[model samples]
Target: KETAAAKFERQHMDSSTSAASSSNYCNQMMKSRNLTKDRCKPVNTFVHESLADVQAVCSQKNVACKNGQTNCYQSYSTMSITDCRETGSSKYPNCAYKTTQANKHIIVACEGNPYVPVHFDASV
Candidate 1:
C-alpha cells in the first residue's frame, strides 16, 4: 500500500511537469478562443509548498520539514496563476477588457481525474 505522504509526493511532485505544461496549454486555448494576433499574453504561474498543517500526506512528503515546520501535516504544493491578456489592435479594436486582473488557483490531481481549478477571480 502506498503511504499518504508517498501518495501525495507521487501525485504532486512527480507531476510537476504537468503543472508547468498546463500553462502552455491554457495559453494556446486562450489564443484559439480569441483568434487574433497579440491577443494572448502569457502569464506566470506560482507553485507553493506549505508546511505545518498536520496532515498525514504532508508529513509523509516532507514538505513541512523542507520549510522547517513540525507537528502539523504539510499542506503540500499547489499553483496560482494569472490569466491571459488580450491585446487591442485595429482589427480587434474596441475590445472591452473584462479582466483587468484575473487569478486562478488549481488543485493537482492524478490519473483519470482532470485538473481542478479551485479559485478564479478577475477584475475588469
Candidate 2:
C-alpha cells in the first residue's frame, strides 16, 4: 500500500551517505523531498538504513508515541541519522535548515496488520 509508508519513506528514509559532508544538505534535501513546497517543516530526520531494516523496527520494543499512542517501537541499536532543523533566519520561500549527524536508536509509530512505520516519533 503506497500510503502512510510512502509518506514516511519520503520524509525519513535516506539510504545514501553521499550528502553527509555537504554544508547545505538540508537546504537541498528539504526541497528535493518536497517538504518545502507548502511551508517550511520545522524539523525532520533522515535515516540511513535499508528499508527492510527500518520496517523491521515495527516489531521491536513497543513504546508510547508522542501523542500517547502505544503503537510506537524503538530499534535495538543506534542508527545513522541526519537531523534537519529550520534555521532561525529562514524565510518562507527560501527555507533554510541546519543539519546534525548522529547515531541513535529510532522510535517510530506503526500500524496495520503487516505493521509498518507511519510516523517518526523520536530518536534516543
Candidate 3:
C-alpha cells in the first residue's frame, strides 16, 4: 500500500520546473499522477520544493483542516507551486487545465507513524 508521504509525493511533488513549457504541464501531469480517474480534480497544487522541505511542514504550526481535523500544518515560508484548475469546458478523460505558478505558504493534512503530509489542503 502507498504510504501517506508517498501519496503526497505522487499527487503533489514536481521538483524541477521551468515556465518555458508550463502551458501543457497540468494537462500532462494530472493524468500521469493519477488524479484523473473518472471526473477531473477541479484544482490541485504541485509543489516545486524538495521532499525534505515539504516533509518539514509536518513540524510546523498546527492548523484546522477543512474537514475540521486537527492534523494539518501551515508552512512558515512560501513555496513554489503550480496550481491546476480544470477549464469549464474540460471533460472527463479529456481533461484540460489552466496552470498558474506562484509561491505561497501551504497547509496540508498529515498522518501515519512518523507523521507526514497526506493531502494538499490549501495555500494561505
Which one wins on TM-score? 2
Steric clashes per prediction: 4, 0, 0
Which residue pairs does candidate 3 place in steric collision?
Answer: none
Give model 1's TM-score versus the native structure. Answer: 0.21
TM-score of each: 0.21, 0.94, 0.91
Write down the RMSD of candidate 1 (Cα, Å): 12.9
lDDT by residue for model 1 (5-31), tens? 443433222222223344344344334
Query: Of models 1 and 2, which has the larger lDDT?
Result: 2
| Prediction 2 TM-score vs. true | 0.94
Clash pairs for candidate 2: none
Sort the predicted structures by TM-score, highest score first: 2, 3, 1
Candidate 2, which segments miss by more than 4 Å at Cα? none
The predicted structure with the larger lDDT, 1 or 3, is: 3
Q: All predictions: root-mean-square deviation over Cα?
A: 12.9, 1.6, 1.6
Lowest summed lDDT across 10 adjacent residues in model 2 is found at 16-25
> In model 3, which runs have C-alpha deviations exceeding 4 angstroms?
18-21
Candidate 1 residues lying further than 4 Å off, grouped into runs, are: 1-27, 33-82, 90-119, 122-124
Strongest candidate by lDDT = 2
RMSD of 3: 1.6
